[PDB]
Design a protein around this ligand. Structure first.
Ligand SMILES: *[C@@H]1O[C@H](CO[C@@H]2O[C@@H](C)[C@@H](O)[C@@H](O)[C@@H]2O)[C@@H](O[C@@H]2O[C@H](CO)[C@@H](O[C@@H]3O[C@H](CO[C@H]4O[C@H](CO)[C@@H](O)[C@H](O)[C@@H]4O[C@@H]4O[C@H](CO)[C@@H](O[C@@H]5O[C@H](CO)[C@H](O)[C@H](O)[C@H]5O)[C@H](O)[C@H]4NC(C)=O)[C@@H](O)[C@H](O[C@H]4O[C@H](CO)[C@@H](O)[C@H](O)[C@@H]4O[C@@H]4O[C@H](CO)[C@@H](O)[C@H](O)[C@H]4NC(C)=O)[C@@H]3O)[C@H](O)[C@H]2NC(C)=O)[C@H](O)[C@H]1NC(C)=O
Ligand SMILES: *[C@@H]1O[C@H](CO[C@@H]2O[C@@H](C)[C@@H](O)[C@@H](O)[C@@H]2O)[C@@H](O[C@@H]2O[C@H](CO)[C@@H](O[C@@H]3O[C@H](CO[C@H]4O[C@H](CO)[C@@H](O)[C@H](O)[C@@H]4O[C@@H]4O[C@H](CO)[C@@H](O)[C@H](O)[C@H]4NC(C)=O)[C@@H](O)[C@H](O[C@H]4O[C@H](CO)[C@@H](O)[C@H](O)[C@@H]4O[C@@H]4O[C@H](CO)[C@@H](O)[C@H](O)[C@H]4NC(C)=O)[C@@H]3O)[C@H](O)[C@H]2NC(C)=O)[C@H](O)[C@H]1NC(C)=O
Lengths: 213, 241, 215
């Protein structure tokens, strides 16, 4: 105890889509909260697998609504570095801290496993209603970092929801994605696609189509 | 003879159960060996010494205390509340006038330690302290009125109950109440007292940019060839046109 | 040392969803008190069903956790219709390490109940190449999230399944999916599998949808 008090530090991973497309910019984010007005200056040190890097971008402090300050530092990461399991450490220093605070984040460990993507048409019983549910089953993938989207004729589908990843018996994850479309469009044979982005997929994506027979 | 006055030591009008508080009946004309009459909710108390010591506060000690000694008037009441809780927002008074300091304390039950304390006014935290610390607002204005409470981190995050504090306005802001050269001139300022202040009176001034022109409550040319500033003598309640 | 301010904490838990819908079962609300110190171990429970105190609660003995604290639990049986009508259940904990008795209250989730729609989805054409195969039960449009989903076949429980958490849908209701994994042998032999769902907005609180190969 004794020296209790001072800011806290939270370290956030990059978005899964951002690590799987080389044109996007994946970033790890180090957020310091509970910074006082009296001791406002915060210092960040970033390490990648234990050696310091100097290209992080640190935003100026911003007054929160609870009278405290918040300071954010963003480190752009290389896609392959994150995918290859490198450890990103943020070290936060401030005179209200008697010893710096260090946080470490990396990709979940374990051999990556490729997801299987199965589209399932609406059940016959659901056809009697106004809207029908198209379902994308994605199973057998590891780690849980994944992205699921729907598309038809080059445009996104607005009305879909995806369950969180669920741990399955064999240690892999599965999820379902429900796209709600008007029964008229489904019966007019319009083709709907479910796109899955995951690191264990060739080119980090696969796409499965689904339409009425 | 003047009125009696009660003083609390510690000055906090809210205390925890089993805490200690001493009440002082002070008559300005100091008296010798006269008895002190103490009252809780109009009912006299056995104690007759010029101070009253609550050793282990209970709910029976809550209410309005007044006192009186010799030929003094009976004091204005002091309200004491006794509560239970993890944290208690202690104030020196619930009612104040503009320019009178307000002292706040986030008191932890049994004097234990909390850290990363927040002080709240009207639900919004306006001050943060890494280590538990009192907080004093010296130049109070009516905007400091509200419900105050506090929070702090022990083994868990704990939060006090609210308590309302009123800072009464002393006088509104001024303006100046008002052509051919060679000119009758009548001019005045824009405010007078709001509380019944018997022995208090305001000082007014008349400024334009950097060129200034006192207790003078009326400004007037010889016959005519701006701002009225209203501030107490203490210079702690400032109002401008 | 001047110790950090703090004492025990209290958590009040609702009955399991299967216990609320079957009169065959007994639903119960559970009041758990953690961080109870050895120095002040006495815990007192007062239960109040909709304001009036009741006394049918039984408290488990103090059990020490390895973080050198005590964890006392008091369970109170509740009536089915009382829980589902909206009765408020209040636990009152008392301890000398507390400045005042802690009170927590639990009740069924408010909001207009909505009936769940249940649909069985057979395996995908492409999954038939595998020898372990997925049977899917979609349950959508239900409120509140309190639901129970199981699988049966030939009178026996099929336990090799997983069910997603409830998910907030665009229309304010909830949906979930249940995946039952069966060997492709059983699916092609024509066995009938059943998805069993229990929810307060169902008639008789129960509905089941069955699934097997079309030809
Ligand atoms: C004063 O106020 C500040 C500010 O708060 C704001 O203002 C006040 C006034 C309020 O109005 C408040 O509601 C406002 O939000 C307070 O600061 C807060 O402090 C608390 C702690 O007291 C923090 O709580 C942690 O939150 C984590 C999650 O935070 C995210 O989600 C919340 C909403 O859920 C958001 O509000 C946050 O901002 C975070 O949002 C994320 O932000 C990331 C970076 O910006 C985003 O990632 C980046 O995204 C960008 C795009 O913009 C790029 O793409 C980048 O590439 C990408 O990296 C991200 O998208 C975004 N997410 C979302 C959903 O928006 C929790 O994870 C954390 O829990 C951990 O720690 C707890 C201990 O405190 C513990 O109990 C938990 O169990 C958990 O512990 C973890 O457990 C797991 C096991 O499951 C372990 O494996 C882990 O190791 C372990 N971790 C740790 C660290 O131990 C906390 O709950 C809160 O985030 C913070 N808010 C903000 C805004 O900073 C402050 O507290 C107030 N002061 C006082 C005295 O009250
Ligand atoms: C000392 O040890 C004890 C013992 O803990 C256990 O023992 C050892 C071996 C350790 O390894 C521990 O890791 C281990 O867990 C500690 O006691 C724990 O104390 C914490 C609080 O510090 C409690 O956390 C709360 O948990 C509830 C939910 O807890 C259920 O789920 C757990 C698994 O997920 C399970 O372990 C729990 O036992 C409990 O499980 C339920 O048990 C009952 C049996 O009676 C059963 O009927 C249920 O079916 C069963 N459920 C399941 C899923 O198994 C969680 O809800 C609490 O979070 C609320 O409060 C937080 C702040 O306190 C807040 O951050 C949250 O947001 C949340 O707030 C709620 O938010 C929701 C919205 O999401 C809102 O609707 C609610 O209104 C709101 N409520 C409140 C009150 O805010 C909280 O996280 C642990 O449960 C408890 N463990 C046990 C076993 O009692 C103790 O802390 C240790 N002390 C120290 C100093 O370390």
């Amino acid at each position: 105890p004794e020296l209790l008090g001072g800011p806290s530090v939270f370290l956030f991973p990059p978005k899964p889509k951002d690590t799987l497309m080389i044109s996007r910019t994946p970033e790890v984010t180090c957020v310091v909260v509970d910074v006082s007005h009296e001791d406002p200056e915060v210092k960040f040190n970033w390490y990648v697998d234990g050696v310091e890097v100097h290209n992080a971008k640190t935003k100026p402090r911003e007054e929160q609504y609870n009278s405290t300050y918040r300071v954010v530092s963003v480190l752009t990461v290389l896609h392959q570095d994150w995918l290859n399991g490198k450890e990103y450490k943020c070290k936060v220093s401030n005179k209200a801290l008697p010893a710096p605070i260090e946080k470490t984040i990396s990709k979940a460990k374990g051999q990556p496993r490729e997801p299987q993507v199965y589209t399932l048409p609406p059940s016959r019983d659901e056809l009697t209603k106004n809207q029908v549910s198209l379902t994308c089953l994605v199973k057998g993938f590891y780690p849980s970092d994944i992205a699921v989207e729907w598309e038809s004729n080059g445009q996104p589908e607005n009305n879909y929801k995806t369950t969180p990843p669920v741990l399955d018996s064999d240690g892999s994850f599965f999820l379902y994605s429900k796209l709600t479309v008007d029964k008229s469009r489904w019966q007019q044979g319009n083709v709907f696609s479910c796109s899955v982005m995951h690191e264990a997929l060739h080119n980090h994506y696969t796409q499965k189509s689904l339409s009425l027979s | 003879a003047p009125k009696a006055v009660i003083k609390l030591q510690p000055p906090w009008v809210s205390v925890f159960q089993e805490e200690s508080v001493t009440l002082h009946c002070e008559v300005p004309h100091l008296p010798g060996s006269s008895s002190t009459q103490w009252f809780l909710n109009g009912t006299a108390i056995q104690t007759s010494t010029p101070t009253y010591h609550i050793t282990s506060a209970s709910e029976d000690d809550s209410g309005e205390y007044r006192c009186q000694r010799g030929l003094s008037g009976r004091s204005d009441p002091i309200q004491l509340e006794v509560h239970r809780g993890w944290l208690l927002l202690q104030v020196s008074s619930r009612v104040l006038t503009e320019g009178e300091p307000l002292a706040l304390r986030c008191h932890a039950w049994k004097d234990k330690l909390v850290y990363n304390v927040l002080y709240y006014r009207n639900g919004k935290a306006f001050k943060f302290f890494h280590w538990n610390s009192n907080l004093t607002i010296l130049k109070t204005n009516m905007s400091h009125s509200g419900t105050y409470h506090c929070s702090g981190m022990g083994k868990r995050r704990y939060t006090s109950a609210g308590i309302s504090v009123t800072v009464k306005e002393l006088f509104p802001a001024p303006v100046l109440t008002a052509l051919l050269e060679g000119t009758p001139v009548t001019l005045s300022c824009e405010t007078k007292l709001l509380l019944q202040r018997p022995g208090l009176q305001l000082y007014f001034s008349f400024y334009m940019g950097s060129k200034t022109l006192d207790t003078s409550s009326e400004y007037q040319i010889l016959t005519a060839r701006y701002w009225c500033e209203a501030a107490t003598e203490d210079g702690n309640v400032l109002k401008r046109s």
